[PDB]
Amino acid sequence: KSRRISRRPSDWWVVKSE
Amino acid sequence: ESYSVYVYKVLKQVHPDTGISSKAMGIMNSFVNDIFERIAGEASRLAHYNKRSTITSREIQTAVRLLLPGELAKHAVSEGTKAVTKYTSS
Amino acid sequence: RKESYSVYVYKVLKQVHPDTGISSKAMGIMNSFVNDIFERIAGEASRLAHYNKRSTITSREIQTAVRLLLPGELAKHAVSEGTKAVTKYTSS
Amino acid sequence: VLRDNIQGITKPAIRRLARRGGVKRISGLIYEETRGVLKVFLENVIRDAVTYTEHAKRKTVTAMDVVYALKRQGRTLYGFGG
Amino acid sequence: RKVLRDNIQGITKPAIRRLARRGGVKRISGLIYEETRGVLKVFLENVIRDAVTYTEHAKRKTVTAMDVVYALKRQGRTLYGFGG
Amino acid sequence: ARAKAKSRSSRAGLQFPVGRVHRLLRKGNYAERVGAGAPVYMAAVLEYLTAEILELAGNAARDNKKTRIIPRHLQLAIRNDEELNKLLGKVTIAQGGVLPNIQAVLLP
Amino acid sequence: SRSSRAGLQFPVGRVHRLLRKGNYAERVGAGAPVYMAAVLEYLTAEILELAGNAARDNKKTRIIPRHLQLAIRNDEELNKLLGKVTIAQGGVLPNIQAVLL
Amino acid sequence: RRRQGWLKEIRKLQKSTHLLIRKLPFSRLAREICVKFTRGVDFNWQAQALLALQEAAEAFLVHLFEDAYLLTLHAGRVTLFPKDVQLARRIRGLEEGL
Amino acid sequence: RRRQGWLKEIRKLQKSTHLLIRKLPFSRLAREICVKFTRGVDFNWQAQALLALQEAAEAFLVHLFEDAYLLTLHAGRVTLFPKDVQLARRIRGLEEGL
DNA sequence: ATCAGAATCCCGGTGCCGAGGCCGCTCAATTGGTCGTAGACAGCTCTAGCACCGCTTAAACGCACGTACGCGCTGTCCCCCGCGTTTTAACCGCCAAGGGGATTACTCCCTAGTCTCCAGGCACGTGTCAGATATATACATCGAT
DNA sequence: ATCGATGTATATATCTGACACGTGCCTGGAGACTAGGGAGTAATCCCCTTGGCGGTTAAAACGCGGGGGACAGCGCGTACGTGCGTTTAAGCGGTGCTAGAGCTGTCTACGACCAATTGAGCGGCCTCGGCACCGGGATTCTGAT
């Protein structure tokens, strides 16, 4: 599949490095 | 008219046993009509800025790269290019 | 060639002010301001005529679009300014 | 006697709105203030929606006209569009 | 000239200070500069990418001023003065 | 005198109707001329997006031990995954409860 | 001589061509470009009148874009209409929060 | 006597999804503000329209409160004050807060 | 001895209208951000385009600082802190802050 | 209050280049007339919003209380801001090469358009099961001790 | 750290109305073919970008001192959550009415389409004055006293 993987970064929104 | 049959088809393809409530079917039914609206509204003025009068597949690809952010672009631009070649193939 | 709005901004400036002049950069500001306000009004009129299965941008649609866009008393004079232009236009 | 309609938005109702948002403690001055805010947000939508009904010949407010007014203001609503 | 400064550090500390003085700010902490140079970069990272895609859709290679103002109008910040 | 009418959605391997979005692009007045392969691209990307939110809605409905997608599950699916969220940042889902957050204030 | 007939200054002919070529809708009624040029003329005349007062206050006979920024943001209605625009070479309004005394 | 009952109240309300303002007084309020723009004549309202309007007002108010609570915690206090709601509308913009 | 020179500094800069960040390092920064998305090929820039980008960046930053300083006075202190800028971006919205 | 020292404001002078006016060209606006069709209008019908009534009851209101929390004050500590000196590098001016934007012409493939046929998708009906809900039981637990 | 009762989870049954599937009908999608023009492509030009050099020069960088600003603590008071009893209006359900959405049928006035005609607007060229800059003087605050 290799579908997109949702991480949970500390930033609520995508500012840098996803 | 609506899009209710195709959401049910895609749902049975992704999950065999699940069902979708009527109100959630109306949610997806308005969602498709919004995303198609935003993509085609982008591709219209993209054709208009370059003095072109036709919407070719380059315009939908650049409008989806303008609208869908991040990895959701990079998959969907594959899914169009995987599809349209097959359409020319047959 | 090239289309603009420079001469009409200049004419309405000479109409409302007798001797004040306008720099060319501010001419480009007004030349983009008109090209933006017109696009917002015609886009509102296009989707508003499309909601009611109408294929015509009629003067009713520009009236409802300018009432939906221009806020407050700017609407209340502009909808007065538009119809006064149309009733004179049918006087020909 | 009949109170003003705006005062029908109770302190239980505003508190139950604020507890959903995660607010822990509420001052007493909120109950007058947000009754104004809910007024102004309702003034902006209806003043579009009535206009969307006036342009059409219909003399009642359809559900489609409210979702059109909310999509015009930018907070688009799902569920009743289609 | 003799040594090369960081390319990312193209915005000097007095420049950011002058921006905040134009913003009506009295006093600046020292830790602003390691973060406002972050929040500028992401802004350009949003704008410039969109402008490049406009230039990418035509066959052209150079980014013109019309493609930056189109990339800003689509994101929400209309810029007057160059479009037209 | 003709063959069996294989519909164009079948020959592209999709589920969304390419003929319907072709008629919507033509009557929509987006542009004077619509290309041939352009609505197929539109239908494929709509198919991929709806399959994405239906997959996340099913995964968000399984752990609640419910076998039927209600609009609360669509709110959880949309708000949990950020890449989708940015796209739908403006929209409000009807009957969608806010995702649970206590804003990190509690007694030790 | 359409403009003379309606007594306006913006040409209704060029906005008639812009309405048809713009592809907003399939047909264009006859009243629409007259109404459109009238409302554009009124909006332009109002913002240029406020800019003319702002240029007369600094004793300059030339409108620079700083004056257009001042005339836009001092008016409480055009600030609503032009909320999300930025004027190139336009300074911020002179505000201050903490009084010295 | 039950201490910290606000936590159970919040954890119940965030899980629930039904509407929180009552239907009939919201309909009386919307019909009252409707008549001011119709230059005196009365309008009817579709039954779905009042539901859609109440959902919109509901979502906007819960977002305004969850944005103002961020400023309350930023100011070092816990109790929500109306100056913070006014500031959150003054920082979200001219057509996001109004 | 010249105290509170920030008052005359602010009153000078708010009166002025020219661009503030230097042109050549801003051009090198934008050409740095350009090369990462063109997969190796370089792009040229029209001379008006870099000025347009610098005007937009300066206007966005002075808006962000004028939004952050209201929060700085809201927390009862005077100096701008990066938690205020992060909060103003967290509260302006999804397309207003980024 | 008292002060000179900056600081600001104004004022005559120079200068330069950008605004504004003029000229010539040309293509886009205007005029006239025909064609068809979207929409105005009128009529008719059948849903759905409005009004009311009456009964239930869960929700709202008020009032007393207590205690958690805003807020004003103070004290210590530190981290920016102003100022002087040194050092960089942005900026202007210049020229030189060429890459690519922009234009023009040619041709052909693609798409609008029409006709003709039929099946995918609509509405309607109807059986059934997922889910809400009520009740019983088992288990964590938080406050008092 | 144990015990109670209050809440939480779970396990059972029960019932219901909304879902899903089936049928039948039909209008929109597909198939085949044409005619014409939008766009792809190649050739050419010259503008505009890049690039590199010298020479100044404001502006950045660096260091230092001091003060004023953030922050932690504490005490006072007060305003809001909680509990209890009382009261009200929201809500179900049910019934009746009709205004008005909505569909259909007709007809015409309006707007697209096209050919011929011309002047309003665009490009370039110029010329001069409004504004930028500067230098001397006049006034007006402002910190130091």
Residues of H in contact with G83 (CB under 8 A): 93-95
Q: Which residue of I has its CA nearest to F91?
A: I94
Q: Most A CBs within 10 Å: which of E37, E42, E43, as the mutation test of the A interface? A: E42
Burial status of residue F36 (CB atoms within 10 A of its CB: 0-12, 13-18, 19 or more):
middle
Residues of C in contact with E80 (CB under 8 A): 28-29, 32-33, 36
Q: Stated in angstroms, how far is B51 CA from J107 C1'?
A: 21
Contact predicate C9/C31, CB 8 Å? yes
Q: CB-based contact (8 Å) between D11 and chain H?
A: no
Q: Stated in angstroms, how far is F64 CA from J138 C1'?
A: 22
Q: CB-based contact (8 Å) between D13 and chain H?
A: yes
Phi-psi map region of G64: left, alpha, beta (phi>0 left; psi -120 to 50 alpha) = beta
Q: Which of C12, C59, C14, C1 is nearest to C34 (CA)?
A: C12
Q: Which of E64, E71, E43 is nearest to I49 (CA)?
A: E64
Can you give the resolution of this entry in Å? 3.5
* Helix extents (H) in chain G: 2-6, 12-22, 31-57, 65-74, 78-81
The Cα diameter of chain I in Å comes to 56
Q: Which domains are delineated in chain G?
A: 1-101 (1.10.20.10)
Number of domains in chain C: 1
* DSSP annotation of G89: T
* DSSP annotation of E58: S
CA distance I68 to I91: 11
Burial status of residue I19 (CB atoms within 10 A of its CB: 0-12, 13-18, 19 or more):
middle
Q: Which residue of C has its CA nearest to G5?
A: C89
Contact predicate F30/C46, CB 8 Å? no
Tell how many helices (H) and how many strands (E) occur in chain C.
4, 2
Please note each residue after which chain E is broken, C-to-N distance over 2.5 A, or write none: none
Q: Which residue has the tokens 């239980």?
A: D12
| Both tokens assigned to H9 | 């109240």
The reply to whether residue H95 touches residue G83, judged by beta carbons under 8 angstroms, is yes
Distance from CA of D43 to the nearest CA of H (A): 7
The three-state (H, E, C) secondary structure of chain I, written as one string: CCCCHHHHHHHHHHHCCCCCCCHHHHHHHHHHHHHCCCCCCCCCECHHHHHHHHHHHHHHHHHHHHHHHHHHHHCCCCEECHHHHHHHHHHHCCCCCC
Q: CB-based contact (8 Å) between A14 and chain B?
A: yes
Q: Stated in angstroms, how far is I7 CA from J5 C1'?
A: 20
CA distance H92 to H84: 12
Decide: CB of F33 under 7 A of nucleic strand K: yes
- For residue B79, what are the contacts with CB-CB under 8 A and spacing of at least 6? F44, F45, F47, F48
Distance from CA of G100 to the nearest CA of E (A): 12
Nucleotide nearest to G13 (CA to C1'): J29
The reply to whether residue E79 touches residue I52, judged by beta carbons under 8 angstroms, is yes
Nearest to D63 among H48, H72, H86 (CB): H48
Method: cryo-EM
Q: Which of F108, B78, I83, I28 is nearest to E44 (CA)?
A: I28
Interface of G with H in 45-74 (CB under 8 A): none
Contact predicate F9/F18, CB 8 Å? yes
Q: Most I CBs within 10 Å: which of G63, G68, G86, as the mutation test of the I interface? A: G86
The three-state (H, E, C) secondary structure of chain H, written as one string: CCCCHHHHHHHHHHHCCCCCCCHHHHHHHHHHHHCCCCCCCCCEECHHHHHHHHHHHHHHHHHHHHHHHHHHHHCCCCEECHHHHHHHHHHHCCCCCC
Per-domain residue ranges for chain I?
1-98
Right CATH for H1-98 from 3.30.230.70, 1.10.20.10, 1.10.150.120, 1.10.10.10:
1.10.20.10
H-helix or E-strand spanning residue F31? none
CA distance C22 to C11: 11
Decide: helix, strand or coil at residue C57.
strand
Q: Which residue has the tokens 């500001």?
A: C29
Distance from CA of B13 to the nearest CA of E (A): 34
Domain containing C74: what range?
1-92
Q: Which of I15, I13, I12, I49 is nearest to I30 (CA)?
A: I49
CA distance D77 to D22: 23
User: Taking chain B, what is the end-to-end CA distance rounded to the nearest angstrom?
Assistant: 29
Nucleotide nearest to D30 (CA to C1'): K80
| Both tokens assigned to G92 | 């911020």
Q: Stated in angstroms, how far is B52 CA from K34 C1'?
A: 24
Q: Stated in angstroms, how far is F106 CA from K1 C1'?
A: 24
For D1-82, CATH gives 1.10.20.10
Provide φ and ψ at B34, rounded to 5°: -90, -45
| Both tokens assigned to F82 | 């950020």
CA distance I57 to I51: 10
Other Cβ atoms within 10 Å of I69 Cβ, number: 23
Decide: CB of C1 under 7 A of nucleic strand K: yes
Q: CB-based contact (8 Å) between D76 and chain H?
A: no
Q: Which residue of F has its CA nearest to D23?
A: F102
Is beta strand D25-26 parallel, antiparallel or unpaired with respect to G62-63? Answer: unpaired
The reply to whether residue C64 touches residue D72, judged by beta carbons under 8 angstroms, is no
Decide: helix, strand or coil at residue D76.
coil
State in words which class domain E1-84 has.
Answer: mainly alpha
CA distance E39 to E2: 29
CA distance E64 to I44: 9
> What CATH number does residue C59 fall under?
1.10.20.10
